[PDB]
Each structure stands twice: as C-alpha cells, then as structure tokens.
Amino acid sequence: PIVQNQMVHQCISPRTLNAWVKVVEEKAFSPEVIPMFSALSCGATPQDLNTMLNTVGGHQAAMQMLKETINEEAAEWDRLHPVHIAPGQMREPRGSDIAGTTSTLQEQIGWMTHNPPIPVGEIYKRWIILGLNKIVRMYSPTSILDIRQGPKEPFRDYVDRFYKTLRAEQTLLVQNANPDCKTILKALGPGATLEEMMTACQ
Amino acid sequence: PIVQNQMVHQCISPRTLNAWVKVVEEKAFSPEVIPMFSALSCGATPQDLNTMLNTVGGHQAAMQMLKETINEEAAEWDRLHPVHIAPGQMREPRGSDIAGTTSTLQEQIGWMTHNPPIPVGEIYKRWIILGLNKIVRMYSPTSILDIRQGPKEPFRDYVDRFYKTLRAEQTLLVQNANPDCKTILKALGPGATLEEMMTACQ
Amino acid sequence: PIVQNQMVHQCISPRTLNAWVKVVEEKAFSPEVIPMFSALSCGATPQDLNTMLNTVGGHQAAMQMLKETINEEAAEWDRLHPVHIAPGQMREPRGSDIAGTTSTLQEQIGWMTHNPPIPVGEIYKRWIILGLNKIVRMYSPTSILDIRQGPKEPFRDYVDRFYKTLRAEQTLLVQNANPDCKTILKALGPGATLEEMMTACQ
Amino acid sequence: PIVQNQMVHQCISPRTLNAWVKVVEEKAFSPEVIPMFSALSCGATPQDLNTMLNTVGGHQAAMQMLKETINEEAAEWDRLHPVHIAPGQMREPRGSDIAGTTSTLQEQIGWMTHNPPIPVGEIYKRWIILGLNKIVRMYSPTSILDIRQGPKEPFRDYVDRFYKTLRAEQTLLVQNANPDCKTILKALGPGATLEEMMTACQ
Amino acid sequence: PIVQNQMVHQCISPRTLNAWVKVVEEKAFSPEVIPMFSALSCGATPQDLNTMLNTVGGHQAAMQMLKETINEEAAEWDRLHPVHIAPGQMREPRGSDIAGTTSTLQEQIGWMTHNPPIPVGEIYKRWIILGLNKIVRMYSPTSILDIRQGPKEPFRDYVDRFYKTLRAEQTLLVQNANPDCKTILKALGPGATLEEMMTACQ
Amino acid sequence: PIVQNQMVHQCISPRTLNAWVKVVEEKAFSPEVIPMFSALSCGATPQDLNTMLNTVGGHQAAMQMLKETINEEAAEWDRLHPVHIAPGQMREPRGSDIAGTTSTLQEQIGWMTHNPPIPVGEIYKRWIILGLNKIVRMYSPTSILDIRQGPKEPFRDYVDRFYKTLRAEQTLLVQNANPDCKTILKALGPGATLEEMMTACQ
C-alpha cells in the first residue's frame, strides 16, 4: 500500500494477505465480504488489489466475471480519457494501467503520490467493488418473496433472514409475517418503526 | 483511525477488523460488547465506524434498527445545526456527513484534525452506542423479576445471574433469594454491603 | 494508555483487550489474575481501566463488589482532597474523576502528563487492585486448615496446594503433613528451609 | 528484504517465513500459490528468496526442477551480460550472483540500493516465478477437455471447475456443458457474457 | 523493560506476558525453561521480573523456594553493600530494592539508566536464575545412574535420555549402554567423540 | 539481535523464540530446519544464538554433538588467531568469546558494531550450521541406494522421496525407477532434463 511515514510505498503485510484469503474461504460472497475487502485494501496500489484477487484459490467463475466487469469499466475509462512521451515525465493512465496489467509499480506510485494525485488505486477498487456486488447478487440463494415467518419461528429470527436476504439481493415485512404476528402488526397502524414492530411480536 | 505520529490518518488494522467480527460472532449483543466496540473504535473516523458495522454478517434485524436510531440522531443534528461554498474551505457537517454516508474520508479527516476540531467520529460513535444499547435491552432474554435463587443454587451464582440480567435490562436481591438465605439477609439489617450479604449466605 | 513517543496518548490495543478478557475467562479470580491485570494496564488512563473492567462478560457479582470498593475509596479521596473555574486551567480531580465516571479523556491526559503529574491512572488502579484482592479472598474455596497431605500424596503436590491456598486466603506445614513425612520433618529440627523440608520428604 | 526507513536492509520476519511454509503445506502448487509467493517476497534480496525456497520441506522434485530453470535463466543472463576489480567498487553481477549462490548479502544490498539500481532481487524473482509456473502446469491433474458438466451439477460449480483447470493448465464452456444447459446457451446467441450465461443456466 | 528508542522504559508486552505463562504451563521446570525466562526478561526491570514470576498460577512450592533464594541473595547483598537523603538525588539500592519489593519503578529506572548504570534488573535476574536452577535440580525425576540403554532401544534415544537427565541433574555413557553397543564402544578405544560412538552403535 | 534503527542491539522477540522452538518440535533435524535457523537468527549475537540452542528441550544427544563441533571450530580459531589490556579498549575475541561462553553481551556488541566490524555472530552461526549439517546427515534414516520406485508408485512421488533423501544425505534416478518408467527414460537418451523425465513417466 501507500501510507504516511510523506506518502511512501509499503509491502502488503502477511496479516492482510492471510485475512483476505481466510474471509473468502469462510464467507464466500456473502455481502459483508465487500466492506472487509475495501478495509483490507486501504491505501492499496493496483498491484496490491491484483495480489488480493489473485491469491484467492477457489471461485474462478466469480473471478472470471470480475475480469469482465473490470474490462468493461476499463473500456469506459478509455472512451472518456484518451491517451496521447516526454523523457522523465508522467504518462497518462489508460484503463489497463489502472487495472495494473500494463503499468509498473513505480508508475502506480508515481500517479498515486503526484500533486495533484491521480488515485489509480481508488479508481480500480471502485471497479472491483462494482464487480463484487454483481457476484454477491447472483450468488444470493433466495428471493425476498420467499422469506416468510414460520408458525413457531421467533419474529427476530424471521427479521434477521428478511434483511439478510434483502442485503444480498439489493409493507412486505408485515405481509410475509405469520398470521399471529401479522394481526398484531396491522393493529399498530402506519409509521411503525422496526423496534416497535419487533417489540410488539416479541 | 486518526492517531498521533501531529494527528494523521492510519488504515484500520486487520487485528481490529478481526477482533470486532469475532466478538459479535461469539457474544452477539451481550452488554460487554458495547465497551469492546468503543475501545476497538478508538480514534475511528465515520468511515471506520461504518466499516466495523458493515463487516458484521449476521444480526441484520439489529443492524436495521441501528440505522433507524442513526437516522433519528442525524435528523436531530440537522434541526440544531442547519447548513448554509467558498473555494478550498471546510463545509459544515450535516447528520449524514457525520454518519459517513454523504461525506468523504478527506472531509472527515478535515473536520477531525481542525483547530478547533469538529469531532465527527466521536459524535457518530455516540449515536451508534445509543442504538447498540437499545438492541442490548430488547435482546435481553429475562426480566429481573424472574431471577430468583434456586433451593440448592449457591448465592454467588444467583447474584451473578441477578446483576448480569440487570446490566442487560438497564431490596429485590433479598426478596428474590431463597428462604434460607433470605432469613440470614433480613437478620443483617439495613446498610448491608454486597460483600457482607455474600459472606453471610456463603 | 499514556506512553513515550514526550508522553502521549495511545489507543488500547486489541491484543491487550483480548488478553484481559481471556485470562478472566480462563482463570476467573485466581490470585495470579491480579498481577496480570496490573501488567496489562501499564500506563492506563482511568478510561482504559474502565474499558478493561467493563469488557468482562461474566462475574457481575464481583464487578458490583468492585464498584462498592471503588466508591468507598473515592469517598475517602474526597474527604482528604476537597475541590473548590479559571478559563483554560486544570481543575482538581475528585474521586469520581479518578474513577473515570465524571472526567473526560482529555482531562485524564491533562492530569497524567502535568508537571508535576497527578497520576489518576495509578491512583485508580490501586483502588481496583484493592477491590480485586477482596474478591480473590472471598472466592478462595478452602481454608489453609483443611489443606492436609494425603497418605500417598507426594509432599511436593501437597506443598503446591498449601501455598496456592495461602496465596488466595492472604509450623502449620509440618502439622498438616502426613504421619510419615511429619516424623521426618520433626527430626530436621528448627530453622529448616522449605528446600530442606522438601528434599527430606522426597 | 530492502525497505524504506532511505532504503535499508531488514531481517525477513518470522510471520513471512511461517506464512510461506504454511501456504506450500496447505496448497502445494495450486496456481494461487504464485501470487502469494510474489507478495510475501516483496522487497526480497536473492538471499531472502533462497531462504523462502530452502525452508520448504517437501516437494523436492519440484525444487530440483526449479533449480534447472534458475540455471537456464542464469546461463542466458551470462550470454547477454558478460563480466570483466577496482578496489572498493561495485562488481557486475553474473547469473549465479543474481541467484544468490556466489554473491554475499552486502553485494546484493550494494546492487539493489545503487543509483541507478541493479535490481537483482526482482530479476531473480522473475526466474523463480517462471520456474514455479512450469511446476504448476505439470502438477495440474486434469485437461480442460475432461472438465464437463454433470447431469445434476449446478452450472456455477461446473464453471468453477472449468476456470480452475484453465488457470492451472495456462466455445468450449458451452460444448462441455450438459444437454439442458447447452440448449439454453445456444439460444442466447453470440456475444454472451459469462454473467448472462450463468444467469441463463441458473 | 528498558530499551533504546536513548534508554527509555516500555510496558511489558502481552506477547511476552503470555509466552512466559504458557511455557511454564507446558514445560513446568524442565531445564530449557530457564534460557526462555532469561530471553523473555531481556531488559527487564525488577518490577517486570516480579510481574513474570507473580503471573504464574501453579507451582507455589517452587515460587516459595524462589523467595527463600531471593531473600538469601538479598541478605548477602546488604552485607557487602551497606546503605547510609540528599534532596533530588539517587539513593543506594539495598537487597529488597533490587528484588523490587521496597523500590518504585522510577527508582529502578533511575538506577538502570544512570551513568554509570547500577543494573538492578540484571542483578535480580541472576538471583532468580540461581533459584530457578535449584528448582530444576530438585524436580529432576531420575538419577543419571538409572539411565541405562534398553535391549531394543536405539542408541540415539538412549543418549537423548542420558543428556536430558544430565542437564536436569547438573565413561558412564558406555557403562550404562546395553551389552551389544557396549562391546562396540569398548572396541573404539580412548578419545572417541560422541559422533563416532553414535555412528558405531547405529 | 543487532539491527539498524545506526546499528543498535534489540531484544530477541517472543515470536522468534517461539518460531525456533516449534520448528524443532515439528521437524526435528529435517534438512529444511537449517535455513529456518539461519533466517530466524538474522543479525543474532552469540548470546542470541546460545539462547535459541538452549531453549530446545529435546534432542540433547544432538545438542551435545553440536557442542563438540563448536569446541573443534573454537580450537581452530585459537590456532589461527592467538590473543595477547589497554584501559577502555576492545580485546581480541578467542573461540570461546565467539561462542558466547566467556564474552559478555557488551563485548559482543562492541565487536559486531566496530569499524571495521569483527562479526562474531556470523562466525559463530557458521560453526553452528556446520554442526547442524552433521546432525542432519547422521539422523537421515535411509540411503539413496534404497530409494527405488514402487510398481504402482507415481514417478513424481518417487522423485520427491529420491531428492528428499539426497538432501538429507548430502543416472541413479533412472536405475532406481521401476521397469515401465525405466524403459521410457532409457528411450529419451542423454541430456534429458528432470522436467522431460517427469513428463515422460507421467
């Protein structure tokens, strides 16, 4: 990554490398993996971002879909930012330079520490997160329409499943509740908070 | 977080990220989780606070209730602190800026390191802890009225359950004691310390 | 804590937070927990000391007894050190300020880094350790009078139990020994060291 | 490694040493091991690279093949860069000096921190990765021709196996699909993205 | 401990605290525990040394014997170095000051960082190691006279037991060997190295 | 160890101490332990090297053989470098000073940080590694002559055993192969690389 000592390059740590590998192994593409990726890739160069992605052993269907999203975003960058070099001067980054495939670590450091900075690490992380959100959505197992409260299921456990599913996918909470809780929630009226609904069906 | 090197931004560590995720997995919303959250979020930016909250996989009913509390506190901030920009100058933070949803990391750093400082991280942590305390209270399984000493239960074990329940929820200690210990505690008289009561029923 | 970089504030580490939580989980209030608490709270502010105490999930009977001891010591501080402010000047700490309940982190830093320093962290740790020693003594399961050597118990194992019990509670070593070892220890005479007694009954 | 404090030598950490040993033990020569090697050897001297390779206990067939690749690349370096010393001056590195077998740590530091730098660590890592890719390819168990979707296998699981195999080895995705999914994928037409194909056979 | 930043005090780390506690739990008073103690207490103040000793939960017979040795060495220090204060000046350390029982942390820092330094940490560690060696010797289970090679025991395994026992306790190697190996070792003659003896009976 | 802050002494870390102890416990004297020792002892003083060796609990036959090698190398040093002191000046190191038995830590620091430096840590590590290689060779269980490919053993698994044994001990690869693979390898002709031989018998 690039961090303050002045902004300088540091090697990606074994702790960071191990943390990302283990979260993907344990959680796959559950929605909470994306905030973890963003946090573990704080200050990351494009090289560091590729390192994190390439160290993942499984899920190569997802990793191939991520490449497609990256190539789509890279092509859109080139359309908006065409490139035209002067000896010892900074070249303009194309899409593949931002993605780390045609740029060196020194060029990436040169862009990220410039004044004003050309934040190639943050631009590329945005493309990666965009691709990761699409993977989270596709690998979401259930529709919100099929999350309904069981006859003896606690309302809290049902609401956990409801908003877990909604997070992966992205009135109905009351409609999908069981007969006993639904009748209570209808009686509360409009403008009921989640807290009040959960207290009522407790 | 923001820490002294002069006050500068540092990346949230894998250790901090992992610690928060594991305590929530192991303890859910037991009352002791809130002091752990506050300690792990020492010097945290609003971005860091969102990172910690968003990395939690389960408990999405609770996380949705937390958003409602955050929105309520954000709306109250806007009522008390209305916003009105001058090129290259610091804008006034609204509720959603304090919550990290409409503010950038650089703006958050700008507020937190200003002289005098506008501590958006500490203001937002206060809102989060307020919301977390409400969740702790709702998820408390038992009323203090139902914590009574068993016939053969040690007084120490009963007092542990009593103040555990009282912590989650928030004369009666003697009333809820068993016949044998109650008679001893009545004989001690007024002004008895917990130490003296526990020694007496040992 | 407060440490040398000049004396500056540092965030309590996840390692320290985790270490204290796990020792209490594994050892409860065995006497060796108190030296571990003191070491883990090296340079601790009153806020840090409260953090460590409040992160403990179980043992709320003990934690309530600790509050009583803290309030007793705080009341004794106020009797000896009554408080009387001048703009931008340091106020005098009362008992509740030393205990971290009515003081801010900045005030605690202000006292601890003053010249001369008002060491509120060390004063409060003294009160906490005083309260923790009382808890260790009450939770000690056995009297030293009931620690006697078994017919086939090795003398070393008996001496381990003897001084383990004595540590928790706080001639008799010979009296509580078994017939065979007692006869040997009587024959050694006065002024026998523990080493010599243990070698004799080996 | 060599890192910024000015560029200075640091000892390879126990964490780095342990991380490399464990990944090889757990993953053998799965393709994702090579990006992990490159990341863990960030800033590595030739001595550090040899340390990492020599600490591997098993897989001595692979380690011997790696030596052959290293010797081939070293011989090609000597053909392109023949060596010709002046007291207290920097000598030109031959292939075996880049590989760390005939050079000292001080000479390696001298080359890597020169202005302009002769990056012997990065040149040698390139040779090692070249040799490691050949080992990954040989130890790949299955041809892409033999990765075909099962009658009841989910398309996602089949695509995972397909691109896992393709990564180790390096129209057909549709041909190797099962009758039901193949018919759907043919109906999509040309220019179908992986996302669209995976959604169609879901 | 006291370390270079100029020599300054640092808090004993949770890693050091945990390491010492676990080695004592796992190894008891096997001889290799003493070099581990010395290494973990590198730069330690008398307070740090007491912390390490006091954090040990079991083995209170041994810890009491250690106190006796410490008191003996402290009494011998007072005989050789009698003490006689001038405002704001450094007092002379007595035995109990070196042992950390009657000295403060600031006085210990004052002695250890003086020019010339009065190394109270190293003097006390010497006394502790002296006491720990006596405990290792007493808790050694077997005499070297009873370490004899079995009929089918490999010579290497026998030599391991022989020098393990000799280390705990502190021609005979040949005498205690089995008939077959003894005859071979007699035939080698005088001046045989351990390597040669072990190769011969392999 | 001695490291750059200027070259200064640092305490050996608990991580380094633990790493060396565990590798010896897990791997004994497999050849890969020697590169791990060298890496973990980077910048080590003679005191640090003794610490690492003395913290090993088992294998006292091997540790005694290591002392013999150390004494042999120390005696050879004294023959080549005889010693002859001037107040406040650096004395010449004898063999036992390099081995850390008759030298203090300050003298070791004095030699290692001199200009020009007398690298007593690196000289002693060389002697230790020499002794460790002899132990690896003696504890090697099998001769390379007895490593032959099984009737149904994969060639890769056989080559792994072959070069594993060769590493511990230090045309035949083809001779020791099974009838089917041997016939294939003979047909390849002279100048066949290991890669080509392994591909042929796959």
Ligand SMILES: Nc1ncnc2c1ncn2[C@H]1C[C@H](O)[C@@H](COP(=O)(O)OP(=O)(O)OP(=O)(O)O)O1
């Ligand atoms: N082979 C394995 N099987 C099961 N669990 C494992 C394995 N390897 C590692 N783990 C898990 C269990 C342990 O709790 C944890 C070990 O990491 P740990 O030593 O606690 O980190 P650490 O505290 O040394 O890191 P730091 O360097 O930050 O102190 O990882």
